[PDB]
Design an enzyme around this catalytic site. Structure first.
Site, PDB file in Angstrom:
ATOM      1  N   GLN A  82       0.811  -1.343   0.113  1.00  0.00           N
ATOM      2  CA  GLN A  82       0.158   0.030  -0.025  1.00  0.00           C
ATOM      3  C   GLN A  82       1.003   1.420   0.008  1.00  0.00           C
ATOM      4  O   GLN A  82       0.527   1.981  -0.568  1.00  0.00           O
ATOM      5  N   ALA A  83       1.948   1.243   0.927  1.00  0.00           N
ATOM      6  CA  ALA A  83       2.995   2.342   0.611  1.00  0.00           C
ATOM      7  C   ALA A  83       3.461   2.438  -0.955  1.00  0.00           C
ATOM      8  O   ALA A  83       3.374   3.589  -1.318  1.00  0.00           O
ATOM      9  N   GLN A 103       0.475   3.920  -3.109  1.00  0.00           N
ATOM     10  CA  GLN A 103       0.258   5.167  -2.698  1.00  0.00           C
ATOM     11  C   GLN A 103       1.329   6.180  -2.939  1.00  0.00           C
ATOM     12  O   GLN A 103       1.002   7.499  -2.976  1.00  0.00           O
ATOM     13  N   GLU A 149      -3.883  -7.312  -1.397  1.00  0.00           N
ATOM     14  CA  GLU A 149      -5.063  -6.857  -1.137  1.00  0.00           C
ATOM     15  C   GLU A 149      -5.690  -6.009  -2.324  1.00  0.00           C
ATOM     16  O   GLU A 149      -4.945  -5.214  -2.798  1.00  0.00           O
ATOM     17  N   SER A 179       7.849  -0.746   2.182  1.00  0.00           N
ATOM     18  CA  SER A 179       7.903  -0.320   3.654  1.00  0.00           C
ATOM     19  C   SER A 179       8.167  -1.482   4.369  1.00  0.00           C
ATOM     20  O   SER A 179       7.601  -2.558   3.988  1.00  0.00           O
ATOM     21  N   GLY A 217       5.080  -5.652   2.132  1.00  0.00           N
ATOM     22  CA  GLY A 217       6.326  -4.941   1.836  1.00  0.00           C
ATOM     23  C   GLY A 217       7.402  -5.417   2.711  1.00  0.00           C
ATOM     24  O   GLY A 217       8.642  -4.726   2.159  1.00  0.00           O
ATOM     25  N   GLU A 237       5.740  -4.900  14.092  1.00  0.00           N
ATOM     26  CA  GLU A 237       6.783  -4.239  13.250  1.00  0.00           C
ATOM     27  C   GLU A 237       8.299  -4.615  13.457  1.00  0.00           C
ATOM     28  O   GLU A 237       8.730  -4.428  12.587  1.00  0.00           O
ATOM     29  N   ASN A 259       3.935  11.826   0.170  1.00  0.00           N
ATOM     30  CA  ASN A 259       4.044  11.249  -1.086  1.00  0.00           C
ATOM     31  C   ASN A 259       4.645  12.102  -2.284  1.00  0.00           C
ATOM     32  O   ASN A 259       5.256  11.733  -3.042  1.00  0.00           O
ATOM     33  N   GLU A 294      26.348   5.139 -11.107  1.00  0.00           N
ATOM     34  CA  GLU A 294      27.471   5.614 -10.098  1.00  0.00           C
ATOM     35  C   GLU A 294      27.204   5.623  -8.927  1.00  0.00           C
ATOM     36  O   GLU A 294      27.919   5.870  -7.857  1.00  0.00           O
TER      37      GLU A 294
END
EC number: 3.6.5.-
Lengths: 427, 408, 51, 63, 427
Positions: free
Chosen positions: B11-12, B15, B63, B132, B138, B175, B220, B241
């Site tokens: 989703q990150a 978006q 999803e 993410s 993610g 997390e 974003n 580089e």
């Protein structure tokens, strides 16, 4: 494409469900016939989570309505929304359980599970990807508790990788209306620990407390306590149907508040509950939702979270709000309270934000908290179970159904150890 | 012939890629329909013989309800309908679901569409992976994607833009387990991972811009500005580089990010924005994009990307530490955006020793949970053995001693 | 009780208050604590570091 | 000259951002009025007895 | 930025502090329903000191009304400005204190003290930076003084860095409408010593001397006495709400007038009080405001500072006026008098100038003084406590509530040392 099957048993589970479906159908613009009369496109987009399309634009719920007497199947059928239910889904027997657990589990309910499992195997094949089930039942009765925890044990052997929520109405010691309450409540908590994935605990003396001191109702009926429960029941499934900035499945809430497999008894709450006199005083912001969500006047269970650590906490917001203000209030409630939160979990609160508010509100929220103050709920039952059973007060009803005395002994130490299991993280 | 295939996982990723591709459409002439009303779009767009321009991106999620908004939004006609890939059930904050059980249903489809995209490009620079750390897809499917891309697409550049977890705020309980179990399995499979976290961008959008209570779109858009300043010398230095001039040792590929003028249009009137001002403002700790401080560490490398017109202390063994690139096109304002219109900008990518505290805190919180074995049954039951916690923790112990060893 | 002597003795034989460090961010007096935000080095001082 | 037109654009943008802020505040007050009016008209707080009326007939009620 | 949480206790405490809010709301242009209708912006820029925001441009005060009987919390609500208060902040018990200091300190007011520290923390933790609380009460009643010292004794411990001002109405020397007065006031002044930053002393007899001899009214009332208290409450806290040429907070007066921490009993006053008929002759200049602060008939306490010495003096001037002509008069009174000023402080007067005047006046002035003639108040309370307590008169109405006789014996010797404390800064 994440469908939810509703299962509902007893008089309590059929009168909650008559009000829950009266709330979802308003949320999606369904009239009592079944035709979509709405003013958006988001309402029709994911109606298949709860509704089955019929021919002619009709929508019928994916619910199964079971009971052991035919008396509560007529007041459901004679409500305002009683003509949307598919008439085959009513499964009712003709001899009641009679406030008896054993007739619900062995004699009457055992001749009815094979006529209910045929029905639920018909709504489990209309779903392209079934998410999970739901049961609403009362632990203080005879066919919510006997047949209801007989269905879960037979569902969980056939669909063993799904999600099986319950919404248990645990008996209260003060608001109690059956002599033989703690026999059925002890022999059913034994049946929920090894066969559910989540179990929200509801006490009727906590719903009367909210309807007396917060909403300030004069005469709260049961129809005003079924509206309190049904606002949380659609608050945990609200990211499966409406979009958001940070979604949450029901599976995602199972991951974050079940650290150990036998610790899944929660306490729900609903944020913007207010009176009619205090409506022009309320300021309608996100810090006001967070102050009321965490209030100990507000939980839908009759146990106070100031008597124990908070293991883990949830929050399922609705509306159009700011992700900075949502995330800075969970940090704010967590740093002042050093010893209301368990030490080995450094971040305890999980947040999700849906984008569509309930019909007639600007924003809302929901709380699903996992505490070690829930083990006082299982000790008022365990001090009244052992007062009666030490002299065998009422056992001849229970023994004469094929049931032994040893089941009243194995269901004592199997709840005496869950109190000690929640105790070992209390300190 | 200077293309960049973009992959947006989670989703990150989706978006962020919405804002990035809106900016990429508006920098060139591309309408959201797909028609222009010159060939410099060729690094990001493909020209169908029916006049339409189709992007070189792959949007992945497990999803469907964050890609369905892309499918029904304003940019509905722009995207190829099968460059947007969706599952049925998500990963549910579970690295095991996102790596072993659910992500294996989509890894082959994503590799098929990536191969179809890479066959069009004559000279491909490298891939950009937006993800993410905290989420399920993610953190699991992204690491599975890099593992199955390393063996398939050679020694190509695999740049990562990651949302590293913030030091005190997060939107999940589980997390740190994800944030360590993904780093342990992407340590050897990546080239350069620019890390920005949401808390520092909240600080900058509160302080530099006057946006109190921002949402994710205001973040974003700034991420999109940084990605455009990175890739702008292909359109108007290279991607190749960066991995030479930012990553000395093959496990220390974790640089930082900064955009120099992030100011509002009611304070761009009050001040000069000369090259010295924006260069000085890159190296200020209030303007970094990770809540950390490079005074309390040692600088190792710096790349300065200019666009348009004794406190800083370096390590013993790298005395120069500077790569400089200059582009001529000034940055482009979007309507509805919050930054001003300016003639000059700088983006600095700096590898520093002062990121050791982030791994020390992450290891502390992983230890705090895992010593009492909380949340382990979810990860064990989904096709993942228990010992991987022990190997990930001793591997990140080696990483902390690496960050101390190079500094000494 | 000699209040003057006891007041002087109380304000000579003692210790000074130590404030919690607080830093101001904006130009309108926004106040935050220092040791829990990510600025001053606190968590690299742990004894578990690097091992 | 180029500095002059950039500063003029910045001043104009400040005017439109301020007007957008004023507009969204007034829309918030409108939503507050809709909030309180719908909650007073709601049957839960009005306690009108008509919610006890039943589809079976006007003689029976919902318990 | 600098908030004040108002507290008020008792029938004396609410009939004072319901007229104070009518004073402040017309000082800021607030109609009886709460909205703003004014013709300045200095009326609105510092209104957050006292008023919480509500919705729709409506402002509600930061006041919490405590009481121990519901009869005086309906005369307040049915006054002119009684509809501006939030209804939750009204706190009242059901059974009275009964002019019994023990009953409100130990028995009746120890369960109400737990129900108001929920209210005072919701209003204290909603401020950006809390300056300090207030109180308004009487040391003759039971709920103003019994429970009303239990509040200060408790919320000094939870908030020990903030400001705790009080506006006492200590018992009158001549008029006395309660026989059991001296047990109330003797047991309460010990709790004021340790837990209070500033305390004013207001005698209702010396309010009667002003309203007859100087203001020249045919019929005074307890609204013409509650206008005199509120016109001194507004003067101390007007450099917080209005800009000046020289400012003075609530701290900057306590820093200067309280040298030693046991000595915080003051003596208010107010300068321009003139009659209808004598207004044509009066109301001239700034020497007619320093003439009438310092006049010994205008003190709001029934104790005369000619008997002793001004430890420290204060003055808060209101009106836009000359920074020279203010400073020349305080030099003029500090030099003519010698033995009315203590020797070891050579600048005993602190001055402040506030721009925006009181309502209906073009200039005004306000006084605070600190005296070693305030210790003739406690030598007259203790002459009528140990008169009664020698032969043990009303002792059963306090001992049967849970006290003991040596709580009395310490509380007189906790006043017979502050009397002999002030007697050593006498010479």
């Amino acid at each position: 494409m994440r469908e939810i099957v509703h299962l509902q048993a007893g008089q309590c589970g059929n009168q909650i469900g008559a009000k829950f479906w009266e709330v979802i159908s308003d949320e999606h613009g369904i009239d009592p016939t079944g035709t979509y009369h709405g003013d958006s496109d988001l309402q029709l987009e994911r109606i298949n989570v709860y509704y089955n399309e019929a021919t002619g634009g009709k929508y019928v719920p994916r619910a199964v309505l079971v009971d052991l007497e035919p008396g509560t199947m007529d007041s459901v059928r004679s409500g305002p929304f009683g003509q949307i239910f598919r008439p085959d889904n009513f499964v009712f027997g003709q001899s009641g359980a009679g406030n008896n657990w054993a007739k619900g589990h062995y004699t009457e309910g055992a001749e009815l599970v094979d006529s209910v499992l045929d029905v639920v195997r018909k709504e489990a094949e209309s779903c392209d990807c079934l998410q999970g089930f739901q049961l609403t039942h009362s632990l203080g009765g005879g066919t919510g508790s006997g047949m209801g925890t007989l269905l879960i044990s037979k569902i969980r052997e056939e669909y063993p990788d799904r999600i099986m929520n319950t919404f248990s109405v645990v008996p209260s010691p003060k608001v109690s209306d059956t002599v033989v309450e703690p026999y059925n409540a002890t022999l059913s908590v034994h049946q929920l620990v090894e066969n559910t994935d989540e179990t929200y605990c509801i006490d009727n003396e906590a719903l009367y407390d909210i309807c007396f001191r917060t909403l300030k109702l004069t005469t709260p009926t049961y129809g005003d306590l079924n509206h309190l429960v049904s606002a949380t029941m659609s608050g945990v499934t609200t990211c499966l149907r409406f979009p958001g900035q940070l979604n949450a499945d029901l599976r995602k809430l199972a991951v974050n508040m079940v650290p150990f497999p036998r610790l899944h008894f929660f306490m729900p709450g609903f944020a913007p509950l207010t009176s009619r006199g205090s409506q022009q005083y309320r300021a309608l912001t996100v810090p006001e939702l967070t102050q009321q969500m965490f209030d100990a006047k507000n939980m839908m269970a009759a146990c106070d979270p100031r008597h124990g650590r908070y293991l883990t906490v949830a929050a399922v917001f609705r509306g159009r709000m700011s992700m900075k203000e949502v995330d800075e209030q969970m940090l704010n409630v967590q740093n002042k309270n050093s010893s209301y939160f368990v030490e080995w979990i450094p971040n305890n609160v999980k947040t999700a934000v849906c984008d569509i508010p309930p019909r007639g509100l600007k924003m809302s929220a929901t709380f699903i908290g996992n505490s070690t103050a829930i083990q006082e709920l299982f000790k008022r039952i365990s001090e009244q179970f052992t007062a009666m059973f030490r002299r065998k007060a009422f056992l001849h009803w229970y023994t004469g159904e094929g049931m032994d005395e040893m089941e009243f002994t194995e269901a004592e130490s199997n709840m005496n150890d869950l109190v000690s299991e929640y105790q070992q993280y209390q300190d | 012939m200077r293309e960049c295939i973009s992959i947006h996982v989670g989703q990150a990723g989706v978006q962020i890629g919405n804002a990035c591709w809106e900016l990429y459409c508006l920098e060139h002439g591309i309408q959201p329909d797909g028609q222009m009303p010159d060939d410099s779009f060729n690094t990001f767009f493909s020209e169908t013989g029916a006049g339409k321009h189709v992007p070189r991106a792959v949007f992945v999620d497990l999803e469907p309800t964050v890609i369905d908004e892309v499918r029904t939004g304003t940019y509905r006609q722009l995207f190829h309908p099968e460059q947007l890939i969706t599952g049925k059930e998500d990963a549910a904050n579970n690295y095991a679901r996102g790596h072993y059980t659910i992500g294996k249903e989509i890894i082959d489809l994503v590799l098929d569409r990536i191969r179809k995209l890479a066959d069009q490009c004559t000279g491909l620079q490298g891939f950009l992976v937006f993800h993410s750390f905290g989420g399920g897809t993610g953190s699991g499917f992204t690491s599975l994607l890099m593992e199955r891309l390393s063996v398939d697409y050679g020694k190509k550049s695999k740049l990562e833009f990651s949302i590293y977890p913030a030091p005190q705020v997060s939107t999940a309980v589980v997390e740190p387990y994800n944030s360590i179990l993904t780093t342990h399995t992407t340590l050897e499979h990546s080239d350069c991972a620019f890390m920005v976290d949401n808390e520092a961008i909240y600080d900058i959008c509160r302080r530099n811009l006057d946006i109190e209570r921002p949402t994710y779109t205001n973040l974003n858009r700034l991420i999109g500005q940084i990605v455009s300043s990175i890739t702008a010398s292909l359109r108007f230095v290279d991607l190749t580089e960066f991995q030479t001039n930012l990553v000395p040792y093959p496990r220390i590929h974790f640089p930082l990010a900064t955009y120099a003028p992030v100011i509002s249009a009611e304070k761009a009137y009050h001040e000069q924005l000369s090259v010295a001002e924006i260069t000085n403002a890159c190296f200020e700790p209030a303007n970094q994009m990770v809540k950390c401080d490079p005074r309390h560490g040692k600088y190792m490398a710096c790349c300065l990307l200019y666009r348009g017109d004794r406190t800083i202390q370096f390590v013993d063994w790298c005395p120069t530490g500077f790569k400089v690139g200059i582009n001529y096109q000034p940055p482009t304002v979007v309507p509805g955006g919050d930054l001003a219109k300016v003639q000059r900008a700088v983006c600095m990518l700096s590898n520093t020793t002062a990121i050791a505290e982030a791994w020390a805190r992450l290891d502390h919180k992983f230890d705090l949970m895992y010593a009492k074995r909380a949340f382990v049954h979810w990860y064990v039951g989904e096709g993942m053995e228990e010992g991987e916690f022990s190997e990930a923790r001793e591997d990140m112990a080696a990483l902390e001693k690496d960050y101390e060893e190079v500094g000494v | 009780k000699n209040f003057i002597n006891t007041n002087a003795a109380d304000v000579i034989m003692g210790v000074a208050k130590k404030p919690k460090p607080i830093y101001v961010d904006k130009r309108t007096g926004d106040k935050h604590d220092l040791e829990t935000s990510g600025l001053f080095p606190k968590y690299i001082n742990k004894k578990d570091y690097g091992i | 000259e180029v500095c002059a037109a950039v500063k003029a654009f910045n001043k104009n943008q400040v005017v439109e951002l301020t007007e957008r802020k004023r507009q969204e505040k007034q829309q918030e007050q409108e939503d507050n009025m809709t909030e309180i009016t719908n909650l007073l008209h709601g049957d839960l707080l009005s306690e009108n007895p008509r919610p006890v009326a039943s589809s079976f007939g006007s003689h029976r009620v919902v318990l």
